[PDB]
Structures are given as C-alpha cells and as structure tokens.
C-alpha cells in the first residue's frame, strides 16, 4: 500500500522571479536578477525574468490550476524589491498589495500558502552596499520578514527563510554563475556566514513578532563513493561537506564541517561564538529540496573541492544532467532525520525533473511520461522514508509552472503544468494530471 | 594632609536628558513616558513639565562654553531613545540622531570626555504600549538601540552606562507611582527590576559585538546604619538594604538576587530561569556610584513593602530633598562597593551633589551657595580618603552641571553648580561651581 | 394596570467570575491584573480580595439549586480568560475550561440558559505585561480566546456578551486608577478604549466564522439630565454624556468618536486609522444595557478631565453605593438606545440592581431588605413601561444573583438577592430574591 | 559570618526511658511503655529500654562525653515512675537520688541542667486511673512538678513541663503506635486538653513554689502547598490544625483551631472556660522540636485528616523518612515568632537526623557525613532565623546518645555520640566532632 499519513500535504512550488514578470511595475524595485538578466553573457539565449509566465497579471487564472490540480498547498516566494523596493526603509503598498491578494486569493480556495521569504532575488540598492558580504545585511533581512510577519499573521502559517543557502552562495559569489555573479571563495566563505545569520536574526525576529512555524529550506545532493581508492573517498568528504553539511551543521549547532578548512584554504575564517548561538536558533520545520545524487571521485584541479561527478551511465539523466535515481532520495530522508535526531519536523519542498517539451501544446496536451515516471517513483521512494520512521510531513512537486530556470532560461521545463511563452497559455501536463491522482487518492494510486 | 588626587583622575558633570533639554516634539522625536507623565494632573509640582527645561536642545554650544569655564575634564550626559528612535523600535530620526552627533563632536573639540548613558529614565512611549519593562523583549529592544549609538559614535564615545539607576527607575515606577510610568505594584517592581537587569547584559553583550571602548551600569546606594540595638531594628535594616542597595548588585556579581526580598515582596516575588542570571551577570568594564546620603533606618510594620523608616539625624544639616550631610558615608560606601565587586572593577563616582535653596535669578551676577561649596569640598576630600584605603577610583561627576527639572519634584529642586534662571535661561556660574574649577585646576591641592 | 411580559421574554441574574469565584489560581489557573491589583494595599477597601469570595467555583452546583429555587430562566456569567488560557495565549487549561463545561451542561441540564461573557474586567497578567489593552494585539488575542470558547460550546451557549462595560474598564481601569490595573494617564485611557472596540469587533469577525448563535456588547450607560439653564452646564452636561455614554455606542453604530472627546481629553486626543472603525462596526446581533442610576452634572472646571461633577438629588432615595434611586430614567434610557441603534437591534437588561445594608448573618433564616424589593419592583414595571414605548427588549438579569465582592469597594456592598454570609458561604434567600421569584413565576402579573 | 549571638546556649538532649534502663529498678515504679514495649507487636524487633544505653549506670561517662563536646547544656527528662513510683504519694528516694548525683554532676562540669518533667513515660497506676483522660491529671502533674521544683531550687533554673503533647496524644491516644496504645478521636481530643491542662497547672505551681524560667515544648512540622487544588489546600489546613496549631493556639490565648470540627466530626468537644485561662497561663519560654517539614495532599481514607504527605524526591531523605530541607526550619522560627508576638523567648530544644550507622565503631570512629551536613545546613538555618530578628536563645541538638527511638527500637540513630549497644561503648561521631567544633568557635566554623 502507498497511502500516505493523515494529514500529509500534497502542494507544489514556485518562485518569484522566475514566474511573475513585471519586475519594475507598481513601484517594486531593482533586483541583482534585474541587472544580472540584462547582462550580456549571463542567460542562455539571452532570457530574462521580465516576462516569465507573467504570473503577476495571471495569478487567479494559475489559482484555478491549482484548484484543478487538487493542491492544499503552494509554496511560493516573496520578492523583497517589489515589497521594500530599496530594501530598507519605504514599503511599496502596491507590491504587498499583489501578494495580499494572492494569500486571500488561496486561503478562499482551500489552498494552504507556504511562504518563502528569500528566493535569490536580493534588491540592488542592497547589494550596492555590499548584499550578503554585508554583516547589517542579518538585520535588513529581519525587518523585511516583520514587514511580511505581521501583515500576513494569521494567514500564511508556514514559514520558510531562505531558499537553498549553497545555490545563493555556491551560484552567487563561488563561481559567479548565478546572481550577483562574483566569484571568490573569500566572498563565499563571508556570504554563507552572513546567509546563516540573517536566517537566525529572521527567526528570532519571528519569535518577537510572528505566529505559527517557520524554518529553513536546504537542498541536498548526497554523494556515493566512486571506489575504494582512499583520494577518492577523500574526495567524496569535500564535496559533502562543501554541499550538504556547510550549513546543516552549524544550523544544529556543530559548528562548521572541519573539511572546509581544506577546501578553502587561506580564504576560510573563523567567526565569534555569538555568530554560531545566532544561527542555531530552534526552529520549528525544516524544507529538503531534491533531485538527484552524484558520485565524486578525486579532481585535483576542481577549484575549489578539488572532487568532480562520475557520470552514472546505467541510469537515465534529465535536461539539466541529473542522474534519476530514486532510492538515494529516501536514504537522504533518513539522514536528514538522523542528522536532525528526528526531532524536526520535515517536508520536501521541492522535488521534480526537467524534460524536454514542444513550446506549444499538441491538440491540447502535452505528454511528459518521464515527467510521469519521475514523479510516481520519487514519491514511491518518500512513502519508503516514512516507513522508516521520517517525520515526513508534506511534499512540493517543484514546479507548478514552466518557468525560467534562472541562468540556463527557459530551456529547462520542470514544471508539471506547461507554459506557452509566445501566448502564456498554460496545459495541464499528464504529470500533473497524474500528480492530481495522487493527491485524490492520498497516495492510493501508486498501488 | 595632602589632597593630590591620582594621575589621570576624572574630574566632570553630569545631567540627564529630559531633565536640560525640552524641545521633546522637536525633528521627528517621539513621545516618551515623562511626555505623558509630566502632562497628566498631580503628578508633578507646581505642575512643571520637560517641555522646555533648560532649553539644552538649542543652547548646547552655551553649556559647553560654559564647561570650558569650569574646567570640566569630562562631561556625562544621557541620550533620549524617543529623540533617536521614536516608537523605540524601528525607523531612526535622523535630526534626533544628529543632534548627538553635533554635541559629541563640539565636546571632543573642546577637549572634553563624552561619556554616555543610555537610559535616564526616558523610555519611548510606544514600548511602554508594549508593556515597557514588564516586558522580557525590552532585553532586545534595548540591545538594537544600544547598537545604534555603539555604531554611530565609536571611537568618539568611549565610556558608555547602560542603565543610570535600576532601583529609582523600579521602585519609583513600578512600586511605589511617584515616577513614569506611575504604576504601583509589588509584582510589577520585581518584573521590571529583573528585565532591567536583563535589558543591561543584553547591552553589554552587544556592545561586546559591535562596540569599542568601556561599558559598565551606574547604580545608586544609601548606606543603611544602625537605628539602635535593637533586633528587629536590625532586621528592618537588612531588609532596606537588601531591597535598595543589593537587589542590583548581587545579581550583577552573579550572587543571585537577596535572599531578603523573599521577606520584602513575598507573594509578589518569583523564581526566574537560570540563563536570564547568566545573562545578567554579563561581565562589565567599569561601575558608576550615584551617591548622595545615608539612612538610618528602624522597624515600621506598616511600611509597605520594606517594613522599615528612615530615623531623622537632626544632629547634621538636610539638603533641600531632605538628605542628611554625612561624608564619611561616602567613602565606607566606596569601600563597600569596592569589597562587593573584589577590587578588581574600576570605579567612577558618576553622580555627587546637594539641593540647596538659590533665588530664581542671580544677585549681580552671582550665587552665593556655601552650603554647596561646603558639601562639595567634603566629599571630594572623602573621595581621597576612599582612594587612600585602595579603593579604585578613577573620577568623579558632579550632579549637575545645570539646575534642571528634578523629576516629579519640579524645578524647586537645583542641583546645579550652574545656576539657571528659568524665565531667561540666562547661565551663572555659582561659588560651587566657581570652587570645583578651582579643584580641578589644582587637582584636589586646593583642599590642603 | 397590567404588566405582563412579552412572549419570550427571558428572566435571569448576573455574575462576574472574579467577583464570586475564589480558587483565582487554583486548577492551573494563571495570575490576572486582579490577583496582583487585589494584593496591592490601599486599593481594596477593608484589604478585600477575591481570593475566597463566594466560593463559588466549589459551590456551583448549591448555586445552580438556588438559580432553580428562584425560578430563574437565565443565568448571565462570565469567563475567566486567565483560567482558561492562564498566559492570555497559548496553552489551554484543560481543569480550568473543564469547570465551565460542567457549569453549563448543569445549567442546560436545570432548563437555564447560559449566557456567557467574555472578558468581565479580568485580563490574564501575562499580558498586561505585554502592554494590555494598549497593545493593538490585544485584538487579536481576545479573538483567540474567544474562538476557545466559541467551539467548547458550540450549541450549548447560544447568546455571548463580549466586553462587559468599555467605560468602566478605561475610565477605572486606565484614566483615573481605582481599577486594575490603576493606571491614571488620559493619553493610555483613549488608547485603551479605542483598543477595547477594537477587540470586540475582532471577537465578532472569529464569532462568524467558528461561531454558533447570537453574539454582542454590553455597555453601561448613565443618562445625564439638566442641572439648571446655565449654559456652561448645559456644555458640562454635553462633556460627560459624551465621556460616558456616546464614547464606545457612537463608532459601535458607525458614527464616529463624539465630537467633544476633543475637548474632553485634549492633547491626549488621536485620530485612528479609518479601517479600525470598520472593524468596531462589525453588525452584532443583540446590545446589553447594564443600568443602575442617572447624574445631573453642572460645570466643574478643576474636575478632570471632563470638568463636570453630579449634584445630589437629595429629593430621592440613594443606594449604599450613593447612586439616587430614579426608575423614569431607566426608561428614558431604553428609549434611547432604542433611538440610537435604529430600532434595529435587540436589547436586554444585562444589569439592574441595587446595594443596601444587609446583616453579615441570616436572622430567622431570612434577610429582609424591603429597599431592594422596592427598587426591583419599580424598575421592573419601568421597563415594562419602556417595552410600550417600542424598546425591542428581549429579558432582563438582576444584578446579582448573590452578594459578591463589589471591586475595589470590596464585601462591603451587597448586591444579591441571596445573601452570602462570608464568615461560613451560607447562603439564604433575601425578601427581594422571593419577590423576584414571583415575578418570574407570573410574567410580571404580580405588580398588577 | 556565622557567630552567634552572646549568651547562646549550645547543648544536646536526651530522655529517660530512651536511655537510662534500669527502669524498674531502685524503687522506680512501672511506666506505661514498660508494659507497651513488653507486649509483642509493638516494638520493632521486639526491642524494650530495658537496657537501653545503661545511662543510669553509666551517666558519669556520659558527662565525660559532654565535656569532650564543649557542650554548655544537657537536656534531660525526668522519669516520674522512677521519682513517685505510684505517680502520686510516696517519693522514691534512690530514684530522685539519681537525678540528684546528676544535677550535682553536670553542675560541677560547667554545664547547665535543662529539666523536662514529662517526656512520655506516665506511670502506670496512673494509666489504671486513666490516665491523660482523667482530668485529675492536671493536679497529679502540678504535685509532681513540684516535688522537683523544690528538690532542684536553685540547681535546675530552666524547666521544661510536657515534651511534644501532639506526639502523646496523635501516638498514643489516635493511633496506637506508642504507648498507652490507644486507638480513639475521642479519647485523643480529651487527652490533648488535659496535656494542656496539666501544663498550666505546673506552671501555676512553679509560680508559687518554682525559681527561674519554665515552659512547654512544641513539635511543629510545617505544611506545604502540593499543588493548586483546593481540595488539597483544605488536606494543607487540616493536617496543619491538627499537627501545628491544636496545641500552640490555645497556649496563645486563641481557643481551639476551627478546622479541629472538621478534622474530629462528632468527637469534638466544647469545654469549660476556665480550662483555657488555665492552659493559657504566662509561660516564661519555649521549645522547638523541629526536623522536617510536610507536603500534604486530600486523602479520604486517611483518618482523621484525611490528608497524606507527598513524597519530596528532590530531596535526601532520613532513615525515618523526614525530608531534610532545612529553609523550612527557618520559616518556621519565623512563624512561631510571629504566632508568640516575639516577646516569649525561644529554644531550640531539639533538632537532629537518623542516618544508618554501623553497630560497631571503625577504628574507634564513626564517619556520618550526612549528620555532620544536615547539622552544618539546619544550624545556619538558625543563624538565618536569628538575622530576622527572632528571639532563639538556644539549641539543643537530639540526641547526644544513640538510644531508643521508641516504637522504632534501636534501629534509629539520632545520636551525635554512637552506641555501640552490644558492648555499651561509646564513640564520638564526625558530627559530635564538628558539633563541638561549632560550640568552641561559636559559629565561626560555619564561616
Ligand atoms: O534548478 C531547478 C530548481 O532548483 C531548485 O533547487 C531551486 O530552488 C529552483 O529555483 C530551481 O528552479
Ligand atoms: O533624584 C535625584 C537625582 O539623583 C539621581 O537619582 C538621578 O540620576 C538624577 O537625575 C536625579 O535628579
Ligand atoms: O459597579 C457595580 C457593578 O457594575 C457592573 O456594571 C459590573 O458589571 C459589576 O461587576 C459591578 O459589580
Ligand atoms: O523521633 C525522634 C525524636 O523525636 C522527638 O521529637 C522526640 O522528643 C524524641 O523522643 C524522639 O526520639
């Protein structure tokens, strides 16, 4: 049997920028997407986030495929330049407006709103005055969470701070692949110190001021041996502690993994103690974001882990070249719970694959059967986790809608719902079909 | 006998906010309890209120001048959170803010250590909407505004107080009303003294993050000496001195709070959680004294809540508050505090001064006030006594430079060495001031 | 003369929770601003608290016997916040909502009808610590402790009071401090009320959507007559009907703050963000009028802050608690409610009663208080009279089912129509209380 | 700073059929607990005073050990079968000979005889005339105490009249357990007024024939909340009337407790008035008896009561199962203060522990840490009581031997001198160390 527990939520993912479109209208502000999109070089084609699925002007419209789609839940990020367009001081009633809307608009339809309060998109105005390099910057966030803390209390009830903490600074100031587009381990080293720390000060500030649960959201990619061959398990430990464990660890409240010593060399720091009870602040949940494993074997000219993937050629591999591999999702649950002591409650917040789709529909479908096959064995593998004791309380399918997957465009479809960007018109996808099922049934379908 | 005081000894004045610098509505600054409790019927004499005071806000150039005069080392002074922070929380207001920075920046021009005080009393009325010191959060609030000013005027403000006065701030506004907020109740004063306390570690240990320099609390003590005898008399003395000069301190030495107050307050008082005394106990680089007499006090059943009573010493003479002249009490107090904190915490006399009567405008253009003169020159030659039994003692503050609004007791009350006619706010300088520059001059050689 | 009862009509008593209760911190009941209000001395006439007082959380079950004896069709209480949810938010104390279950399952049992108060003066100390009812999240958190009881009872308590007297909880409460938690200041006295209707708007709002039955305030009001054709009282007149009687009905019936509030509280005076009126607006179902007595006030201009003052109307009788004894004004008074809410909305009597010496013990297992018999008589046929004149009353509840503790004036006046002796909880029922007893038994065909 | 007050009086206390023996012997008469401990069932172990610890032989010894122990007083009771072998008529003068050689003996040491007329051990042709339920009592007493108010004129300046009346009645009247074993509410509501009674009476006569200081001895075991249920604080208030208030209320002029109708129902009484100007009778002193304190619960089925004490397991516990929580000792001091006016001078007449100790000494030593703790944490606790301006003159502490703890048998070691009750060797304990210690230095060994 695959039904699930009473009241597990079934729901599905977005982000702000990569689906709502009018950036700068109705007072919002600059983002660092802004100026990174509009930067020769930086997107694949030359996309950028101005249009998206203009979800801004079409979000009622998204709402009824929501409702079509039998979802409780719909997680979705707050862009903080819509909302405080300088990122201190003057808020921008329009843009609180658009997102006061949509939270009235979901709780009337039965939808629970899971909020995420940063998504990537940091306002320009802050990352002039240094963005994540920035120690105030702990304190901008804070006030920027009251500001949505006290204006949503009551109804949005779920809480998520920052959104992949090794994307933002991995993407961001590592390999400068991702907005602001720097790349220094010094500036990753501070960047990933300062995003734990605004997290703490977000939450403590939630304490204060807020109502309900709130936590973090990480992504894991857990790795696999490639050998024996002691350089390579060596290897294998860089790499986890450079991806999975650089901010679950001090998030715990173990402080930094001792591989990072070696893996940044000369730009590591150490931090007060002060920092550390800062960010171990208690919360209350926290998200997994997952897709896939790897199997790092030893690459002593991989800056900076000195580690790369071995391509897993008995296996299938999406557009964005991650192995599918459905088992290493369950464990990874289990190491979570292990790493957490099974005290924190716990929800994928985003789970999915990225398949090839024709721009348009195809006499009014469009049938994904990898989508399909992704989605039926991943949540197979989540119904495993729970069998073995993972407190295991939601899953977001990532993501509702086709949208722009950051600098590699719009080339990579992960949603379950199509989008034709030439018309905006949006096709339900049989994987969300699908998806749909196993919402209605509770997981009954997958017998 | 020699009265040379040590090498690089402090010598300075002091003053409060609301108490100089009126202009309370003025730039963006917001409204404080003293707003509120000033302009509410009875609680104040003769109906005076901090709306205009000593005109300070506009005449700051004036008073430095003026410090000048005095040869004044060291000027201590308190910022207006409202002024800086008007809900006390949130948006900063930049001309409140500017204000300091001007007054800082012409203190250090003319040669003078600015050593500040956080709160004097003046707590934002949006906090106190908020429940004010009843409530825990004011340990952060008051951490996030103490950051403001660490940031703002480090490497110009080196000497910091966290808190002037826990016990008048609790018992005059919890316990007993006669001060802002006015509230009159044993469970609140317990609540508030211990969130005070808590409110001064969490400044401390942000200070500690992002500041630079020398912080420390500034507390008040009145030595309590034997009535009599007699053994409830005894008691009714430990219990006064339990709740007036150890309720702070102890815990502040990390010693837990008087085991007597459990007798003073009793149903009223509680247990609270082991950390917030870590918290409390949050080392501290120096200590200020505001002292300015002793009691004598017997068994009074009916005395609520400390079951005791001053006995009045009519064999010395009574300031204009009613304050006995006793020197030597000063400097055993320097030594108790010096015991109390192991010699090993540097000490500074943060407040010394006497009330006296002046005419409300000066006689050609003088003030003669021998009775200040005469308490000054006392207890600074008790301050070299207390340094000579190894007290350490790094200066000492005369309260106040201005006449000034003594709180709910009006302008009747002039504290000043500075006399100031309230109808002109015109300055003269009286025989105490005119003798402590003398003192300064000479280093204390004047007393000989 | 006939003065039988409309169809319907519902005959009851009231209570308040810490005015019979005791056992105020029993069960894992929490600390209110009474408790600590209470244990403060100088407040409570005689050292009076509700520690023991009617002993009725033990005795309620020999109450309900008694509501029976008294054929009483209604019994009008309230609930204690801090024994249901002892930190005002939060954890729910399962004893403590346990003993109002079974309270109402035996009053529904007995064929009496529960009508239930939410917030009768007794907020939990946990918030007040937080701010009261100065903070604006008070809102809030009354709607949450509203919803607690909204589903306990769901179906069993069909009619829900949410504020008893607005006026009585600022103006005692927070502007002239002879109420906990005795504060004194006019600027937190309007920010309370505004707060107060905000929170009973916020009550109403949750009451729709969890809520089942009939919900409303309940307002004192106190009709101000002329006191001569001098103009100035005549303004006086105006000022103190406008503090008292039109401050929370006029935005409760969309029409805004009174225009003389202005001039009543001056400088404390604050004009409120629009949508916080559509709020206090919330449409209700029903309004309680607690009624007692009228004023006749002439100009006082040091009286504050509404400079007027009362002149005793020495033609009538006055109760012990010094209130004249006038039952047209009663009338008058349904009149004009009936006038100021359209005709629209239901009323009843929440309140109605009178104080009078009665003897600390029984004499022949009888008390005989022909003034209160006196004073239920003649109101009772006023509002049969107010009833012709096309007031929608729909029942009435004597104040009070038993002698309790009158706040801050303590035991010392009686209320009940069944007296208490506190020397050992006997109760017995006073001469009024039988005669009440025929009143309802006959629909009021016994005052033919 | 722990020095004591000038003129505190330090000692340690015994009593006569605890451990004299020869009990019957030199003309003394028969006692009650003569017959109740030869009677089998009653006793642990079948254990008597018989022997004891042979003090009627050995009491020269004994005052060598108080002089070891810096002790400035002793305590003692007299046995009023061994004086009037009858209880009333004719002296036995071997019998008061004995107490004579005593007196004399401590007198002679330096030490100050502190004398207790009744501690327990009735006559038996007293007992055959009713004993505490014959109102005559009250003037055989009043003779008895007269017979040693005269033969000790001058020697024996400090007297006690009646040791712990609640322990005599409550024991021996309402349950059984000691000696005369009767179990009756009846009889105990009639034996405690006539304790009280005979008190006074002994009182009136050392006014008219007695020199220097006497008063009664009170145990009191102070009732604490166990929770917040009224029913609960009723049980508080019963077992504190029945235990604390029965006997120290009427002494103080305010009649009998209220709660006593509730506690004994129908077996209740009113008496004469004249009986309570009697019993209220000015007293020069009093003794405390103190030791632990009560956490009562309701209980139904406890007769009468109907109260029970919750076990305190946050704390170290005696061999006879009393707490040690000493602040308690304190609060009480206060409390008795408050309930005297402060103007009646108090004593500590008894304060100890029972903690296991070997039957035989090891080398020639007795290591109790326990004891030694209990007596440093309880005498400091006196000090505290001194500092809020009680009027304690004095302590005493039970017991300067190892001897019969009655009903218990011997199996219960209060003493600060150990006995070894095979041999009748004695041994100093660490505590009788320390506790000479704390005499010598006056408290400055507490710091
Ligand atoms: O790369 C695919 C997805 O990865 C997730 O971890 C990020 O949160 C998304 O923003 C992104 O679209
Ligand atoms: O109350 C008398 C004076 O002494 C101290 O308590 C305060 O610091 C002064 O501001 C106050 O005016
Ligand atoms: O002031 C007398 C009475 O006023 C009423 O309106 C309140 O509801 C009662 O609690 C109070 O006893
Ligand atoms: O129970 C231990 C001791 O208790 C005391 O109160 C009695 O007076 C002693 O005789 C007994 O040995």
């Not at 009830?157 to 790349?183: Q, S």
């Not at 007060?272 to 960010?279: A, G, H, S, V």
Request: with cysteine; charged share 25%.
């Amino acid at each position: 049997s695959y039904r699930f527990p009473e009241g597990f939520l079934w729901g599905a993912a977005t982000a702000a920028y990569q689906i709502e479109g009018s950036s700068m209208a109705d007072g919002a502000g600059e983002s660092i997407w802004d100026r990174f999109s509009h930067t020769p070089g930086n997107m694949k084609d030359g996309d950028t986030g101005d249009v998206a699925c203009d979800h801004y002007n079409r979000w009622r419209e998204d709402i009824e495929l929501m409702k079509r789609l039998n979802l409780q839940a719909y997680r979705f990020s707050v862009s903080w330049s819509r909302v405080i367009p300088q990122g201190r001081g003057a808020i921008n009633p329009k843009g609180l407006a658009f997102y006061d809307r949509l939270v009235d608009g979901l709780l009337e339809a039965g939808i629970e709103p899971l909020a995420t309060l940063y998504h990537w998109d940091l306002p320009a105005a802050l990352d002039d005055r240094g963005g994540w390099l920035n120690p105030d910057i702990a304190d901008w966030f804070a006030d920027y969470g009251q500001v949505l803390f006290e204006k949503f209390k009551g109804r949005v009830k779920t809480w998520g701070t920052i959104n992949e903490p090794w994307c933002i600074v991995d993407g961001g100031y590592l390999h400068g692949a991702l907005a602001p587009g720097h790349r220094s381990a010094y500036e990753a080293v501070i960047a990933g110190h300062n995003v734990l720390r605004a997290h703490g000060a977000a939450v403590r500030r939630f304490r204060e001021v807020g109502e309900g649960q709130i936590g973090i959201v990480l992504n894991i990619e857990p790795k696999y041996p490639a050998s024996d061959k002691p350089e390579d398990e060596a290897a294998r430990r860089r790499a986890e502690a450079q991806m999975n464990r650089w901010f679950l660890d001090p998030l715990m409240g173990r402080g930094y993994p001792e591989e990072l010593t070696d893996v940044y060399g000369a730009a590591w720091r150490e931090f007060p103690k002060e920092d550390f009870e800062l960010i171990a602040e208690p919360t209350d949940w926290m998200g997994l974001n997952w897709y896939t494993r790897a199997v790092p074997e030893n690459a002593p000219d991989a800056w900076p882990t000195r580690s790369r993937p071995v391509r897993q050629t008995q296996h299938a591999h999406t557009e964005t070249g991650w192995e599918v591999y459905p088992p290493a999702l369950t464990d990874t649950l289990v190491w979570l719970s292990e790493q957490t002591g099974g005290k924190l409650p716990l929800m994928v917040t985003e789970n999915g694959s990225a398949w090839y789709d024709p721009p348009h529909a195809i006499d009014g479908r469009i049938h994904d059967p990898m989508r399909v096959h992704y989605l039926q064995t991943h949540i197979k593998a989540l119904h495993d986790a729970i069998g073995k004791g993972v407190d295991l309380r939601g899953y977001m399918v990532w993501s509702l809608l086709d949208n722009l997957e950051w600098s590699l465009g719009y080339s990579k479809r992960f949603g379950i719902v199509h989008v034709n960007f030439a018309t905006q018109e949006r096709t339900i996808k049989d994987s969300g079909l699908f998806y749909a099922e196993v919402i209605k049934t509770h997981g009954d379908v997958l017998n």
